[PDB]
Structure 1
């Protein structure tokens, strides 16, 4: 399925994902696309920080859901 990832500068990218994908996997895909190390990535959905070991399904992240990406050092 597709999900949207929106940055703090208002740019949205799309990712092909499955509900069984972990947040770790998602950050890995974002690295594949944008070259950002997963350690610098923060993903938030419905005001929550998303934990690396949990899946998208765990957070009820569905088709065409929007995650917010916040970079941190």
Structure 2
């Protein structure tokens, strides 16, 4: 299923995943495109941070969902 990870500048990174994929896999495919280690990325899904060890299904990330990639220090 195709989701969009949007950066702060609104740049859209398409990503193909499965419901049982860990959120960590989404971070791996963002790393392939952007160069950011997964542990340096923060992914926001409608206002909420996510646990990388949970799955796309746990968080109800579906086809056409849009996640936001935060790349700033806390």
Same fold (TM over 0.5): yes
Deviations 1:14-73 (A, max 9, x none): 001111111111101111122111111000112110111100100111001000000134
- TM-score, structure 2 as length reference: 0.91
The residue aligned with 2:29 is 29
Aligned residues: 73
Higher helix share goes to which structure? 2
Give the alignment's Cα RMSD to 1 decimal.
Answer: 1.0
For 1:26 and 1:53, locate their aligned partners in 2 and report how far apart those are by CA, in whole Å: 11
- TM-score, structure 1 as length reference: 0.93
Unaligned runs of 5+ in 2: none
Unaligned runs of 5+ in 1: none
The residue aligned with 1:52 is 52
The residue aligned with 2:61 is 61
